[PDB]
Amino acid sequence: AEFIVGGKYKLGRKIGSGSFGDIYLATNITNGEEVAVKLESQKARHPQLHYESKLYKILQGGVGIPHIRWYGQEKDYNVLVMDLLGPSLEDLFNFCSRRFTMKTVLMLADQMISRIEYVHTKNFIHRDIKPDNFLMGIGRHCNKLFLIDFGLAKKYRDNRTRQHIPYREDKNLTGTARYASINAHLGIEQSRRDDMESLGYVLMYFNRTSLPWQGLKAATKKQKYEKISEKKMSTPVEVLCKGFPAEFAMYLNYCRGLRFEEAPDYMYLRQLFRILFRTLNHQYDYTFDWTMLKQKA
Numbered sequence: 001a002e003f004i005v006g007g008k009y010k011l012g013r014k015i016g017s018g019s020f021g022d023i024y025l026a027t028n029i030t031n032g033e034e035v036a037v038k039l040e041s042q043k044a045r046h047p048q049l050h051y052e053s054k055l056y057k058i059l060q061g062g063v064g065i066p067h068i069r070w071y072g073q074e075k076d077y078n079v080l081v082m083d084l085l086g087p088s089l090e091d092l093f094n095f096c097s098r099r100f101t102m103k104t105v106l107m108l109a110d111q112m113i114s115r116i117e118y119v120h121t122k123n124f125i126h127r128d129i130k131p132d133n134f135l136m137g138i139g140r141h142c143n144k145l146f147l148i149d150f151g152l153a154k155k156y157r158d159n160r161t162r163q164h165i166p167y168r169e170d171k172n173l174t175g176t177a178r179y180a181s182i183n184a185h186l187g188i189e190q191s192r193r194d195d196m197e198s199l200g201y202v203l204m205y206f207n208r209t210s211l212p213w214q215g216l217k218a219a220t221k222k223q224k225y226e227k228i229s230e231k232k233m234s235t236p237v238e239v240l241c242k243g244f245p246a247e248f249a250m251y252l253n254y255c256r257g258l259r260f261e262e263a264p265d266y267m268y269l270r271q272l273f274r275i276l277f278r279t280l281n282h283q284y285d286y287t288f289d290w291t292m293l294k295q296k297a
């Protein structure tokens with residue numbers, strides 16, 4: 001057919017766009033398995049796909065890390081082939097009319113903290129934690145959450161010594177402004193704490209349906225980012241999390257309190273949400289809000 005990569009993956013329709021390229025559905029012509037294919041044009045001032053493919057290789061063996069099938073060059077493109085995955089948390093949020101129950105938020109939180117933790121144990125930070133980068137799997141993996149898109153990810157410490165990258169300022173906000181940590185807005189070098197703060201804004205985005213720094217306008221990119229920053233800094237966490245269980249405010253205070261080099265206590269943060277979950281008499285049965293709507297049909 002018209003477009004086949006690595007001698008066997010026939011590219012079908014476009015399924016979306018990522019950080020540095022476009023994503024297609026494909027089929028392995030030798031066994032019939034459906035996969036996802038990421039194409040980056042080889043004519044790029046600064047090509048990164050080789051870099052992202054190296055990160056995925058480093059991360060193999062993690063729960064909710066997609067397996068890589070092939071990396072290479074085809075026609076005028078760099079090509080990466082991987083597991084096909086299901087919808088993002090943003091897709092599912094819209095499917096549920098931009099409302100999630102507490103049970104769903106807490107079940108997701110347990111997996112999200114763990115996905116981020118794994119990336120950190122391999123000495124990387126993600127730097128673009130948002131609903132669009134968390135995907136549910138498919139088939140028997142449909143209740144497994146995957147964290148993807150390592151285009152903006154960065155080594156935060158040395159493997160041998162565990163010395164961090166240098167503490168410094170005057171960094172561009174590289175990720176998404178809505179979920180960015182306060183220190184990232186100020187141009188401070190991101191570390192593990194910033195991924196965790198970002199997850200806190202995602203959880204509160206799901207709980208509230210919106211964040212108070214949404215809908216802001218300004219003359220420039222930089223001034224919109226500066227308005228978002230100022231709103232984040234002038235909104236107390238108790239106000240942001242008013243009318244929700246105290247655990248969400250505790251999460252956010254804990255993450256802001258972390259020092260640049262300090263290891264988040266992931267076990268404690270998972271425990272914080274799990275004790276709440278079980279106090280509300282919920283069980284981890286993977287009956288999410290979208291599961292309810294599908295089986296009713």
Ligand SMILES: Cn1ncc(-c2nc(N[C@H]3CC[C@H]([NH3+])CC3)ncc2F)c1CC1CC1
Nearest residue numbers: 015016017018023036083084085086087088
């Ligand atoms: C950004 N990025 N990078 C890798 C992948 C990515 N996406 C999928 N499936 C998508 C189907 C359409 C859904 N709306 C989203 C999930 N499977 C594997 C992937 F690596 C994606 C998600 C595709 C929307 C870009």
